[PDB]
Design a protein around this ligand. Structure first.
Ligand SMILES: Cc1[nH]c2ncnc(NC(=O)CC(C)(C)C)c2c1C
Length: 167
């Protein structure tokens, strides 16, 4: 038993809800919140911009030190950093950005990072300003993640479409 509330159960381990991941993180304080990151950890907009704003830019400060030491992530890769006031940890995961021309096949590799964590709160990878089809992202999530994932979908209209079309 965990503290997530109001989710629809899609499969044995995948759950979905119309919610703002920022507000959801601030209430649940999950062990792991997933950020929709880029390889430079520049958290300017989309989910990443919103999570960082909620940390009063502390996420960005930590991220800049990480990149200065380690260099950029790989598309499809991840790193674990602090969750600041939102979660114990933040798993920064880089899904392909279609608006940059990146290979959509890398979306499965991106979701594989979730399997290193028993329970996670997450957005749909590569959705939103990353340009991928969210219905496809949900399909890849369900077919790749085996640990317990709680998906927060900000847009109410998109959520209903995701549910109604889920096979
Ligand atoms: C600030 C914020 N918070 C979120 N929490 C969960 N999911 C999110 N993204 C989407 O739902 C996909 C789109 C944007 C509807 C296509 C977001 C965003 C952009």
């Amino acid at each position: 038993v965990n503290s997530f509330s109001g989710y629809l159960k899609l499969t044995d381990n995948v759950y979905i809800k119309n919610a703002d991941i920022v507000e959801e993180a601030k209430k649940v304080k999950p062990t792991v919140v997933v950020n929709a990151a880029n390889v430079y950890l520049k958290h300017g907009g989309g989910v990443a911009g919103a999570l960082n704003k909620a940390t009063n830019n502390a996420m960005q400060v930590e991220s800049d030190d990480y990149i200065a030491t380690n260099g950029p992530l790989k598309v499809g890769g991840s790193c674990v950093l602090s969750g600041h006031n939102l979660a114990k940890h933040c798993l920064h995961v880089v899904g392909p950005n279609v608006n940059k021309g990146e290979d959509i096949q890398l979306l499965k590799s991106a979701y594989e990072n979730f399997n290193q964590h028993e329970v996670l709160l997450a957005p749909l990878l590569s959705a939103g300003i990353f340009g991928a089809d969210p219905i496809h992202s949900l399909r890849v999530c369900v077919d790749t993640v085996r640990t317990n994932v709680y998906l927060a979908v900000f847009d109410k209209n998109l959520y209903d479409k995701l549910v109604s079309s889920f096979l």
